[PDB]
Design a protein around this ligand. Structure first.
Ligand code: 4OL
Ligand code: AM
Ligand code: CL
Length: 177
């Protein structure tokens, strides 16, 4: 039992897909350098820490995707599968039935140059609520003011105000394996 209120998800027409997506080149470790979404809230008290996400391309061309987070003084690992969707660079979550409440989960790689930066769009419906986010990935923990501003401009184009955009603080624990 609850009430909640969310900024509506954008139409998918407003979310570009990276042209000629190269699944092999996208593999390896990415740091989460920016986050924006209808459940992202800039929280001064307890700032969001950076985490890392590792993409491994399997034989069947799905990804095994592993996120590594520092929480409660430990390294925490979240492993899931991205299954190729309706065009290259688009995916759905594998084994959706195994996640209670979850009815849909879409990933779309918006842009990347494979060896420095990427922006990836996610949309999920859980308990009948529609969440969306944009993740800014870096191959390193830093990215430029310019790239941050581009991410902010893109996020705003999807209806997000500035207080729904955060830049996680770089850390050294866990994520530099
Ligand atoms: O609104 C979104 N995100 C911002 C709030 C994140 N958060 C606060 C942080 C929680 C900490 N964790 C979660 C790590 C563990 N997770 C899970 O066992 C899990 C299982 C199944 C689906 C799923 O989504 N998760 O996370 C991350 O930091 C983390 C790292 C990497 C990828 C990732 O996805 N997460 O969350 C939430 O509580 C939340 C609210 C609403 C939806 C939602 O999925 N989550 O996780 C969102 C929109 C659309 C797809 C989507 O996956 N997300 O997260
Ligand atoms: Am999530
Ligand atoms: Cl991620």
């Amino acid at each position: 039992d609850s009430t909640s209120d969310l900024i509506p998800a954008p139409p998918l027409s407003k979310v570009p897909l990276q042209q000629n997506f190269q699944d092999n080149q996208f593999q390896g470790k990415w740091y989460v350098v920016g986050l924006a979404g209808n459940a992202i809230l800039r929280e001064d008290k307890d700032p969001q820490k950076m985490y890392a996400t590792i993409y491994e391309l399997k034989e069947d061309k799905s990804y095994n995707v592993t996120s590594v987070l520092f929480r409660k003084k430990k390294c925490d690992y979240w492993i899931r599968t991205f299954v190729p969707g309706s065009q290259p660079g688009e995916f759905t979550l594998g084994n959706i039935k195994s996640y209670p409440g979850l009815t849909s989960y879409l990933v779309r790689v918006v842009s990347t140059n494979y060896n420095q930066h990427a922006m990836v769009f996610f949309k999920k419906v859980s308990q009948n609520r529609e969440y969306f986010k944009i993740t800014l990935y870096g191959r390193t923990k830093e990215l430029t003011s310019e790239l941050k501003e581009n991410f902010i401009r893109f996020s705003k184009s999807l209806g997000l105000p500035e207080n729904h955009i955060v830049f996680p603080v770089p850390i050294d624990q866990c994520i530099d394996g």
